């Protein structure tokens, strides 16, 4: 639950938890722009 203990034992967990956030927030924009690129391909 805590962070600045995990950093105290293992400081790389910083740059392993900064990732898996900018991926789990970059795929959601590349997903909604799918459902949009395809809902304008549905009215056709």
């Amino acid at each position: 639950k805590n962070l600045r203990i995990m950093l105290k034992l293992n400081p790389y967990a910083k740059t392993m938890r900064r990732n898996t956030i900018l991926r789990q927030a970059r795929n959601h924009k590349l997903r909604v722009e799918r459902a949009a690129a395809a809902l304008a391909a549905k009215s056709d």
Binding site: I5, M6, K8, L9, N10
Partner: protein, 50 residues
């Protein structure tokens, strides 16, 4: 293995039971094996080293 070392993982220093809040508690009793942190002890357990 992570959620057993980080949470319920206590040491054994001089027939006692002292927890793990720093690397220097490992590096006293395991300095003769190039084990100086927790993530080396985990590479050892997961892949079983010498």
């Amino acid at each position: 293995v992570n959620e057993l070392i980080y949470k319920r993982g206590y040491g054994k220093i001089n027939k006692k039971r002292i927890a793990l809040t720093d690397n220097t508690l490992i590096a006293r009793s395991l300095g003769k094996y190039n084990i100086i942190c927790m993530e080396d002890l985990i590479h050892e357990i997961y892949t079983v080293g010498k």
